Amino acid sequence: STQYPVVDHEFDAVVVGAGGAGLRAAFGLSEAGFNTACVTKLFPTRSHTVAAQGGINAALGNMEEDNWRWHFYDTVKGSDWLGDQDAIHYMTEQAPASVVELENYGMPFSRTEDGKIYQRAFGGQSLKFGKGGQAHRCCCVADRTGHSLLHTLYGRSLRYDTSYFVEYFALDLLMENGECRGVIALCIEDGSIHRIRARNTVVATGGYGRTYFSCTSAHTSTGDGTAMVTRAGLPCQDLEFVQFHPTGIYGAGCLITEGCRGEGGILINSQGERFMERYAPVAKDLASRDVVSRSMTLEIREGRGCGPEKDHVYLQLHHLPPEQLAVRLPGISETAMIFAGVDVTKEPIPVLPTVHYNMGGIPTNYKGQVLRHVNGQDQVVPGLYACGEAACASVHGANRLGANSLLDLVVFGRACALSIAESCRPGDKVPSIKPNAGEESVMNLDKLRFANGTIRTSELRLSMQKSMQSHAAVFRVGSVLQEGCEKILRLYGDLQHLKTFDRGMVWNTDLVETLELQNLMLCALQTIYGAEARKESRGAHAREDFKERVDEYDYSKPIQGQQKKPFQEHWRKHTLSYVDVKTGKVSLEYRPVIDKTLNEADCATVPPAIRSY
Amino acid sequence: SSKAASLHWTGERVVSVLLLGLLPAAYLNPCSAMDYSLAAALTLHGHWGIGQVVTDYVRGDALQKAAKAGLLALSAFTFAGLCYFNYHDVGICKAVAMLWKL
Amino acid sequence: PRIKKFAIYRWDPDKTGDKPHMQTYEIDLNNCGPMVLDALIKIKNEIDSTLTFRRSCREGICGSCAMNINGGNTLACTRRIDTNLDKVSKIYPLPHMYVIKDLVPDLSNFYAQYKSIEPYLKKKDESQEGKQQYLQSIEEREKLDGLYECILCACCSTSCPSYWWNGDKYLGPAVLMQAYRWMIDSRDDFTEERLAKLQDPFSLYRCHTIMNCTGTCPKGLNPGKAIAEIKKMMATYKE
Amino acid sequence: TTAKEEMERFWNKNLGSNRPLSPHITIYRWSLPMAMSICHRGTGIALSAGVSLFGLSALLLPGNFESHLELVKSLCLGPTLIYTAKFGIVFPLMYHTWNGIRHLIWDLGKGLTIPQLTQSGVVVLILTVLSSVGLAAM
Numbered sequence A: 001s002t003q004y005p006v007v008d009h010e011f012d013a014v015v016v017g018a019g020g021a022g023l024r025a026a027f028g029l030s031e032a033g034f035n036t037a038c039v040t041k042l043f044p045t046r047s048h049t050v051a052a053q054g055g056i057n058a059a060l061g062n063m064e065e066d067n068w069r070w071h072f073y074d075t076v077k078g079s080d081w082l083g084d085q086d087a088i089h090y091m092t093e094q095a096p097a098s099v100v101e102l103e104n105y106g107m108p109f110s111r112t113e114d115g116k117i118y119q120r121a122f123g124g125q126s127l128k129f130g131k132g133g134q135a136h137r138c139c140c141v142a143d144r145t146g147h148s149l150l151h152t153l154y155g156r157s158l159r160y161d162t163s164y165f166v167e168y169f170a171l172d173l174l175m176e177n178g179e180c181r182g183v184i185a186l187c188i189e190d191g192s193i194h195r196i197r198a199r200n201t202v203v204a205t206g207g208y209g210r211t212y213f214s215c216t217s218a219h220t221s222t223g224d225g226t227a228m229v230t231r232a233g234l235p236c237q238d239l240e241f242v243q244f245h246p247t248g249i250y251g252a253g254c255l256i257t258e259g260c261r262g263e264g265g266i267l268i269n270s271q272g273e274r275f276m277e278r279y280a281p282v283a284k285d286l287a288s289r290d291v292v293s294r295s296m297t298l299e300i301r302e303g304r305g306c307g308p309e310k311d312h313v314y315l316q317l318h319h320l321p322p323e324q325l326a327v328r329l330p331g332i333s334e335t336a337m338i339f340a341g342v343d344v345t346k347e348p349i350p351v352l353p354t355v356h357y358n359m360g361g362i363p364t365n366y367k368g369q370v371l372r373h374v375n376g377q378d379q380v381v382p383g384l385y386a387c388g389e390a391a392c393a394s395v396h397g398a399n400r401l402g403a404n405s406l407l408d409l410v411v412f413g414r415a416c417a418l419s420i421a422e423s424c425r426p427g428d429k430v431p432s433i434k435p436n437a438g439e440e441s442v443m444n445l446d447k448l449r450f451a452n453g454t455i456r457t458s459e460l461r462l463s464m465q466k467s468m469q470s471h472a473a474v475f476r477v478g479s480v481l482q483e484g485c486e487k488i489l490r491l492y493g494d495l496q497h498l499k500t501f502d503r504g505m506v507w508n509t510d511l512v513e514t515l516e517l518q519n520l521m522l523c524a525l526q527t528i529y530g531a532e533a534r535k536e537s538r539g540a541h542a543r544e545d546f547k548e549r550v551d552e553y554d555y556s557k558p559i560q561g562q563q564k565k566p567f568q569e570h571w572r573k574h575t576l577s578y579v580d581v582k583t584g585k586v587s588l589e590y591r592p593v594i595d596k597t598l599n600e601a602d603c604a605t606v607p608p609a610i611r612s613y
Numbered sequence B: 001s002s003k004a005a006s007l008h009w010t011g012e013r014v015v016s017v018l019l020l021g022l023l024p025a026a027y028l029n030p031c032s033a034m035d036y037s038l039a040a041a042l043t044l045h046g047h048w049g050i051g052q053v054v055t056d057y058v059r060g061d062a063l064q065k066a067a068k069a070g071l072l073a074l075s076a077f078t079f080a081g082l083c084y085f086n087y088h089d090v091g092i093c094k095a096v097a098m099l100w101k102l
Numbered sequence C: 001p002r003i004k005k006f007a008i009y010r011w012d013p014d015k016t017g018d019k020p021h022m023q024t025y026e027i028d029l030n031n032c033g034p035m036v037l038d039a040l041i042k043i044k045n046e047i048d049s050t051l052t053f054r055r056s057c058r059e060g061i062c063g064s065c066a067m068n069i070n071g072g073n074t075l076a077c078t079r080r081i082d083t084n085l086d087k088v089s090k091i092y093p094l095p096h097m098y099v100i101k102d103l104v105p106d107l108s109n110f111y112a113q114y115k116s117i118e119p120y121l122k123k124k125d126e127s128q129e130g131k132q133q134y135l136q137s138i139e140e141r142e143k144l145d146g147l148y149e150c151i152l153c154a155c156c157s158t159s160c161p162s163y164w165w166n167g168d169k170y171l172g173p174a175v176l177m178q179a180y181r182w183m184i185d186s187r188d189d190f191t192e193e194r195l196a197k198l199q200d201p202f203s204l205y206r207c208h209t210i211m212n213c214t215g216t217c218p219k220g221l222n223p224g225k226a227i228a229e230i231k232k233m234m235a236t237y238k239e
Numbered sequence D: 001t002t003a004k005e006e007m008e009r010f011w012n013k014n015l016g017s018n019r020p021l022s023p024h025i026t027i028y029r030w031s032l033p034m035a036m037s038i039c040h041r042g043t044g045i046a047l048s049a050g051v052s053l054f055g056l057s058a059l060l061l062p063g064n065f066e067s068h069l070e071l072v073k074s075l076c077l078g079p080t081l082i083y084t085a086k087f088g089i090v091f092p093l094m095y096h097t098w099n100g101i102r103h104l105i106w107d108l109g110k111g112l113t114i115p116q117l118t119q120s121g122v123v124v125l126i127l128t129v130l131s132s133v134g135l136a137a138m
């Protein structure tokens, strides 16, 4: 310690992450008049949202008549009723205004003949509450909506006085008596340490797909934000619910937007059957992500692969007009060729269900405020917010509806900014900080910095990934899960036998990738454990032991003469997980899901029903 | 505001097409007139030409300012020298002519 | 067994008196990915984890890879390794740029330049923004195709000789193209002032139509073709 | 911080440091277009030098053009040298000429594609040789 001089900055608010969520939160705070700081370990534009292709949902009604309430319904249903309906209400109702806000910012949306934002079909989205038929509200910029979303947002941010700490690694939250005072980070450029303290902190660090071996996410999705919350002793929610995306190149795991299916493409097994019509008649190829992949992954078992080892499947687009694939899916054509070597206009792309999205994250309020659990009740953590994939207001619940994440980013990124602007004023007193705050972080830094262990960082990460890949995949059971838990808890122990080689102060990717490992582990522990404990099948989480949807009641048959099971007797509740940073001991609890909306009169609550597409 | 940079750009193109039409014109119709306009465009075009090379490679207020100055001189003595030649001598056209059937 | 040789540029800022030098690495291509980045990641995790370089999407759309591979600027995660074991791949940092460490260049000036063109929509009346979606015919929209796909890798600009010699005052291909992206967006109302911002001898006019930029874009875009369009507008707009 | 301040910070940080400049011309792969780009200047420069030498000589040196020509006639002028020198003068002029035409066409915004680029380059190169040998015999 004290070998690393510390620089102290002082702002009104701090935003960790410059993705869609972070970015919107940041300039949204400055637009409000707050001296905002934004910490990112990557150049804002390198953020993961750039990879987004599908689009962003919004009941604009450009293709046909629509009602954000139908969007509401589709989303709550798609969550298998583990999603908090109050947040889902807020998100879907704000969607239209949020999308128009983006277009007015300059986002180059694809147009219709009326000159309005072009929208398109997508996974499980209907009209008139699942009765009116396939809906078309997935707004999009050709096939590179994410890339365009992030860029326009970034551009728009240059318009304000926000101080962007580029390529800075957030180490930990500056906590003090249950209140957040800011963050402490490592300036990758010169290896110095900075304590950015503020009145409010917003965590938008993205997901942690990298906890697995095969994922569609970038090498940077290491759940660093989740870890911080965990290190602070705060709970993380539903980390077990990991979304497996159907279409993912057998190779590197790169993604091929579901927009392909919505635009017309299909999925074909070895025998040539459009299986996605057998497992789900109505929705077919265009059903929930959790179901559609659960299908394919299954077909592989029966022995129906479409390549050498019959391990994957085949995504088809061929029958679509070559021009359409050029105006609606130009982005996939490229990578499909570059990573697979295929002419989509005349050949189907090789895809396989791979890790993709994380519904779980930091417990959140529909206002973006982080929650902690006290005496079985929610409590707002003073000066701490979270949004995006890293957050879990849980508008996705047990399964995220395609094209709902980008919306989530923009909506709650705005919500966080608004909650802060509505609860305080710029210039208010910025909390004190002990002259030793963050000392633990620096020490841990210094430690790994000169690690002379026996295990290489890469070796360890590889052990964790393949372990998660084998014990916590699309299908699981107590046996496979428990071996995984102890298997992963075992690796966590090895974090003290790790070897690092680089020891400079400038760009020590060796040091940071290790720091990221520490984070990935904390996420894996909570994912695998919360997974073994959840004995039921809801959304993405499918147990062979319990292929049942254990709710408070049995919503299949009527409800009245039936008795309500005790809270701790059913599984329609969020998983709250903690972990002793020092031993890796996972302890977990649960809290109810919110079923009431913001206004029964404007948007009625949708009671749990049978899950089926 | 003033569009100096853009106008200079177009100016270059103009004398460029002009010096392009003169070469042929100077062949089909050799005359004192041609020898002068050919000397004007030849030196001007060359002046703006080297100019670009100067602003490109010469870094620093001191040097570029001087370079530009020295360039202006060379150009001046060049156009004058050519006009002198067209007046008190054969003229560039007939000079080329003579020089070839040699 | 198929060993491939890799010559890589290196430089440690925290190693007194260290000077730029090439370090060769060997890799069994059967135990690796098809792209150059895969090789980098491999020697990173097994041979020498002191090798530093930027990366993220490994999908070719974030633009973190930008580096010179065999004399050409491209994306390491998209450029497939030369299976010709006889040839030794040469990896260098982006051309004429300050090296922070190994293959990591300082793109601060690059980004700063992008900011100077105000890459965002500007309406004369912003009192009604946020309530209605602006209209734009599919025709007006097609004009953006080939412009908005820019990933900002800096591969083009960092391949332009003019940017090499005057990167301080010359905006470069990347930035200039985006300026054009905003110039022809039917929704923007500051076309005239966007052009006026280029009324000096460096920002735009350092471009001598060399065309290296376009000949190296990892996304098959055409900056040069765009620079030319700007020039034409520059000499024909009024006021 | 503004764009300008950011630029100022950039230079103040790098100029005053032990940071090295990554190689460029020494490592970048040569391409016909790049090469033809260099030659345009070179020729343009050499061409201007010639014209200036002709103008200045006309002001400082004595005697008329003929005094200078006859001066060369009586210099054992070998035919397979009078043509050589005549070619060397026509070569750079023609190259620059044709490539210049190409440059103008580009300003109109045409032919600015990699494919179209190589074609025009070859053409300009061919026209150069033809017009050169052609003129060296007029």
Ligand SMILES: *Cc1cc2c(cc1C)nc1c(=O)[nH]c(=O)nc-1n2C[C@H](O)[C@H](O)[C@H](O)COP(=O)(O)OP(=O)(O)OC[C@H]1O[C@@H](n2cnc3c(N)ncnc32)[C@H](O)[C@@H]1O
Pocket: A016, A017, A018, A019, A020, A021, A022, A039, A040, A041, A042, A043, A044, A047, A048, A049, A050, A051, A052, A053, A054, A055, A056, A145, A146, A168, A169, A170, A171, A204, A205, A206, A207, A216, A217, A218, A221, A223, A224, A225, A255, A257, A356, A357, A387, A388, A389, A390, A402, A403, A404, A405, A406, A407, A409
């Ligand atoms: C993986 C993926 C996801 C995806 C998609 C394609 C791919 C390949 N396509 C989508 C689509 O077409 N439509 C849609 O509705 N969703 C799609 N998704 C899912 C969605 O894009 C993601 O969930 C979302 O983009 C996540 O956004 P978020 O803003 O939360 O996160 P991020 O962009 O991943 O950025 C993370 C930011 O945090 C900073 N960071 C991270 N760790 C640190 C530390 N330690 N210190 C400082 N900063 C940190 C990053 O630098 C970054 O800015």
Ligand code: HEM
Pocket: B016, B017, B019, B020, B023, B042, B045, B046, B048, B049, B050, B052, B053, C208, C209, D040, D041, D043, D044, D045, D047, D048, D049, D051, D096, D097, D098, D100, D101, D103, D104
């Ligand atoms: C046949 C007639 C000619 C045409 C059509 C022509 C055309 C051009 C064009 C289009 C350029 C600009 C290139 C660019 O964009 O960078 C140029 C530059 C130049 N030309 Fe010519 N030119 C001609 C004759 C000459 C002659 C006879 C000379 C010699 C005195 C000359 C000297 C130059 C120089 C020095 C440059 C500057 C090149 C640079 O920017 O480095 N040109 N010419």
Ligand SMILES: O=C(CC(=O)C(F)(F)F)c1cccs1
Pocket: B023, B024, B025, B026, B027, B028, B030, B093, B094, B096, B097, B098, B099, B100, B101, D138
């Ligand atoms: O008769 C002429 C004149 C001519 O082409 C020019 F006038 F120079 F353009 C020439 C004779 C030898 C070379 S050019």
Ligand SMILES: O=C(CC(=O)C(F)(F)F)c1cccs1
Pocket: C161, C162, C165, C208, C210, D025, D034, D037, D038, D041
């Ligand atoms: O200064 C240069 C660059 C040059 O020669 C190189 F391209 F770098 F090889 C040039 C400027 C105008 C045409 S070439």
Ligand SMILES: O=C(O)CC[N+](=O)[O-]
Pocket: A053, A054, A055, A245, A256, A257, A258, A259, A289, A356, A357, A401, A402, A403
């Ligand atoms: O993430 C998803 O399930 C669908 C969106 N993406 O475009 O494919």
Ligand code: SF4
Pocket: C149, C150, C151, C152, C153, C154, C155, C156, C157, C173, C174, C177, C216, C217, C218, C219, C220, C221, C222, C223
């Ligand atoms: S134009 Fe092409 S090279 Fe130049 S940054 Fe945009 S992507 Fe890269």
Ligand code: F3S
Pocket: C159, C160, C161, C162, C172, C173, C206, C207, C208, C209, C210, C211, C212, C213, C214, C223, C224, C227
């Ligand atoms: S290399 Fe440059 S010089 Fe012009 S064409 Fe492309 S910007």
Ligand code: FES
Pocket: C054, C055, C056, C057, C058, C059, C060, C061, C062, C063, C064, C065, C066, C075, C076, C077, C078
């Ligand atoms: S890492 Fe993203 S483009 Fe190559």
